[PDB]
Amino acid sequence: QLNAVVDLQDRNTELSYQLLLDSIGDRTRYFSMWNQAVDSYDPDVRIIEN
Amino acid sequence: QAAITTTPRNNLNPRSWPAALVYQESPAPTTVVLPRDAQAEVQMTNSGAQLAG
């Protein structure tokens, strides 16, 4: 009866994946299974070009 | 046949039997050392790391 998940809420495991994937191949790329394309915004809208 | 392996008795039909030559089985003490080490576990768990082996 082993436990490889003694994982507490203090450390990062949810955030561990995010900043590592952004370094290899940029997250913006199109994918099938993976919802790879980033939960971002419009860079030309948040700063007004009015 | 009444003297071949019988082992002749003190009284021809006794009451309470002893242990000699009535095949008292002695299976040898099964000796295993340790599944995990006690001395290797005390030093780590008190100072830092947690384990599951």
Which uninterrupted H or E stretch holds B47?
A: helix B39-47
Inter-residue contact A2 to B51 (CB < 8 Å) = no
A35: closest CA among A20, A18, A48, A49?
A18
User: Looking at chain A from residue 5 to 44, which residues have their Cβ under 8 Å from any Cβ of chain B?
Assistant: 6
In angstroms, rounded to a whole number, what is the distance separating the alpha carbons of residues B9 and B36?
52
Q: Is A3 on the interface with B (CB under 8 A)?
A: yes
Closest residue in B to A1 (Cα) is B52
Q: Is residue A38 a contact partner of residue A27, using CB atoms and an 8 Å limit?
A: yes
Which residues in B lie closer than 8 A to residue A8 (C-beta atoms)? none
Whether A2 sits inside 8 A of B52 (CB atoms) is: yes
Burial A16-31 (b: 16+ CB within 10 A, else e): eeeeeeeeeeebeeee
Alpha-carbon gap, residue A16 to A23, rounded angstroms: 12
Rounded distance, CA A19 to CA A36, Å?
13
